[PDB]
Amino acid sequence: SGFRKMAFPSGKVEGCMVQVTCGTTTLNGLWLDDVVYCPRHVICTSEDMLNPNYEDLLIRKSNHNFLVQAGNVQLRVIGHSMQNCVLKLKVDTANPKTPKYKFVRIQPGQTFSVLACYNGSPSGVYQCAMRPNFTIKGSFLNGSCGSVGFNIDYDCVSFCYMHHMELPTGVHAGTDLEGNFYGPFVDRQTAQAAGTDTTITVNVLAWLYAAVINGDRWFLNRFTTTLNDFNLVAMKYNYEPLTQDHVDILGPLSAQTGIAVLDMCASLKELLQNGMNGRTILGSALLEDEFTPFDVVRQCSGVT
């Protein structure tokens, strides 16, 4: 028992982190096979952060200008290309620690672990969620760019995020491993305000199921609701609308606890309307939304 914000074991990803330097900018790169992936803004100086023309800036760069270091040893760059907002640096050596991997583009509400790195070295691992406004609430300092987000299925790492920037509001923006930003964000120092950070309703319900499984049951009420009634309350509280797909995904948790999804929705509705009244659920005084139904099942079953 017990329920924690758990990240995937980071070992497989630690073995992929390298340092990339271009001119005076140093950030992190992800080394998979003979390719090092990093944010294309590694080529940017100070005088051109406001409106960079990446194709133009890249013309002035050659293979030897990208310094890639894995541990304390230098990798030889034999090719470079820009794919969307990422640079792909072909090196002459395949990473011997390359795990089985995939590049996936996640949807909002989906969770992943972040291996925060500086100078190609891992500093920490934490669990994130792609917010409905396509930002992530990470912990990233200068030099953390190129740190990646991932999920692991047994021995296959699915890379889903690469850190690129921090918005003026202290929230984070990044790309998938094909270089496409999540959301409307661009890699330039400009006014980029995030949209409404709504609560991931399906995740909150999953976490309420995790609370019941772990003995926290005080919030369970005598009520039920409908998807349409619940959604009127969810809209009022800036919660994402709950769909029949979400109800279906919560089915295994509903089955394990014997609590119908719509009954849990009614409990959630009363929590939104009445508040916690100074009480806690799984050690939290707010409704946690960064656990998917899959994470709750995985953690409560012990998937390795």
Active-site annotation, residues: 41, 145
Nearest residue (CB) to a second copy, 124 versus 184: 124
CB of 123 to ligand VEG, least distance (A): 13
Residue 257's H or E segment, with its range, is helix 251-257
CB of 67 to a second copy, least distance (A): 18
Please choose which of a second copy, ligand VEG, none residue 275 contacts, taking the beta carbon within 5 to 8 angstroms, the exact cut-off set by kind. a second copy
- Strands of 66-70's sheet, edge to edge? 73-75, 66-70, 17-22, 25-32, 35-39, 86-91, 77-83
Contact call for residues 108 and 132 (beta carbons, < 8 A): yes
- Report the residue from 166, 176, 187, 240 that binds a second copy according to the rule CB under 8 A: 166
**Rounded Cα–Cα distance for residues 90 and 130 (Å):** 29
**Rounded Cα–Cα distance for residues 207 and 190 (Å):** 37
CB of 118 to a second copy, least distance (A): 5
**Rounded Cα–Cα distance for residues 287 and 268 (Å):** 9
Please choose which of ligand VEG, a second copy, none residue 121 contacts, taking the beta carbon within 5 to 8 angstroms, the exact cut-off set by kind. a second copy
Contact call for residues 129 and 109 (beta carbons, < 8 A): yes
Q: Is 253 in the site for a second copy (CB under 8 A)?
A: no
* CA–CA–CA angle 225, 229, 230 (5° rounding): 70
**Rounded Cα–Cα distance for residues 297 and 101 (Å):** 23
Q: Is 119 in the site for a second copy (CB under 8 A)?
A: yes
Q: Is 137 in the site for a second copy (CB under 8 A)?
A: yes
Nearest residue (CB) to ligand VEG, 121 versus 190: 190
Judged on CB neighbours under 10 Å (0-12, 13-18, 19+), 25 is: middle
DSSP string, 40-56: GGGG--STTSSS--HHH
Instruction: Note the residues at the interface with ligand VEG (CB under 6 A).
Output: 27, 41, 44, 49, 140-145, 165-168, 187-190, 192
- Joined together, the tokens standing for residue 94 give 């395949």
- Report the residue from 23, 99, 122, 252 that binds a second copy according to the rule CB under 8 A: 122
CB of 194 to ligand VEG, least distance (A): 10
Q: Is 112 in the site for a second copy (CB under 8 A)?
A: no
Nearest residue (CB) to a second copy, 8 versus 101: 8
**Rounded Cα–Cα distance for residues 124 and 102 (Å):** 22
Nearest to 272 by CA among 284, 259, 287, 285: 287
Q: Is 26 in the site for a second copy (CB under 8 A)?
A: no
- Report the residue from 95, 110, 144, 199 that binds a second copy according to the rule CB under 8 A: 144
Please choose which of ligand VEG, a second copy, none residue 49 contacts, taking the beta carbon within 5 to 8 angstroms, the exact cut-off set by kind. ligand VEG
Q: Is 71 in the site for a second copy (CB under 8 A)?
A: no
DSSP symbol at 92: S
CB of 11 to ligand VEG, least distance (A): 23
CB of 10 to a second copy, least distance (A): 5
Q: Residues interacting with a second copy, by CB under 8 A?
A: 1-12, 14-15, 115-119, 121-126, 128, 137-141, 143-144, 166, 170-172, 214-215, 275-276, 278, 280, 283-286, 298-304
